[PDB]
Amino acid sequence: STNDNIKDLLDWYSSGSDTFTNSEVLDNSLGSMRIKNTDGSISLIIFPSPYYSPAFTKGEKVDLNTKRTKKSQHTSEGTYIHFQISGVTNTEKLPTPIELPLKVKVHGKDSPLKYWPKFDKKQLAISTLDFEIRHQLTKIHGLYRSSDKTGGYWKITMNDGSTYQSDLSKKFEYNTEKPPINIDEIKTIEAEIN
């Protein structure tokens, strides 16, 4: 059986995200941005980490592969609003959608992929990658769904030596998160479960 901490993580990781494209920067202030989405909804997004501090000016276009911090709401003027965290990248696309090299090992034994699509964006926020990764892990492999599957790590080995990783037991550290990366420069992605 799982501990209460685990459940909370499962919920977080099995509740999809909010993909938006070509949204407009309305306001950018320390810690957050007000961005007008294509469907006319307004997204209020927070960036807790001082390392990843969005610098687009009021007027620029940006993409969003983010998550909701709490239930979305309606304003007095009838506008729908979303409260999200991280996930704001520039608009540059890739000449051709590429598959990100993902490898998974459930308790040592390798396990072939499934919900693994390709991407079209030049850059992606690490949080985004984290939840994509974790999402497949949970949905497909059984992460957080059983006592014997409550931990591990995902490691992103870059083309230029640099590395990225997170503990599959703690909620991604949004507060210390590093800037977005160019997925075509990713060398490999590894994931392990215990």
Cα–Cα–Cα angle for 153, 155, 157, rounded to 5 degrees:
170
163: left (phi over 0), alpha (psi -120 to 50) or beta: beta
- CA dist 52 and 66 (Å) reads 14
Around Cβ 11, how many Cβ atoms within 10 Å?
A: 10
- CA dist 52 and 182 (Å) reads 14
Tokens representing 94? Answer: 């890739």
Around Cβ 106, how many Cβ atoms within 10 Å?
A: 19
Cα dihedral value 159, 110, 135, 87, nearest 10? -10
Around Cβ 187, how many Cβ atoms within 10 Å?
A: 13
Note whether 15 and 65 are within 8 A (CB). no
Method for structure elucidation? X-ray
Q: Is 40 helix (H, G, I), strand (E, B) or coil?
A: coil
- CA dist 98 and 120 (Å) reads 7
Q: Say what the resolution is, in angstroms.
A: 3.4
- CA dist 155 and 177 (Å) reads 14
Tokens representing 49? Answer: 């980490």
The full DSSP string for 91-140 is -PEEEEEEE--EEEEETTEEE---S--EEEESEE-HHHHHHHHHHHIIII
Beta-bridged to residue 133, according to DSSP, are: none
Q: Which amino acid is at 180?
A: P
Q: Which amino acid is at 156?
A: I
Tokens representing 122? Answer: 């030049």
Note whether 89 and 123 are within 8 A (CB). yes
- CA dist 117 and 153 (Å) reads 20
Residue where the block lists tokens 């160019």: 182
Nearest CA-CA partner of 62 in 119, 123, 134: 123
Question: Domains of the chain (ranges plus CATH)?
Answer: 1-17+89-194 (3.10.20.120), 18-88 (2.40.50.110)
Around Cβ 57, how many Cβ atoms within 10 Å?
A: 7
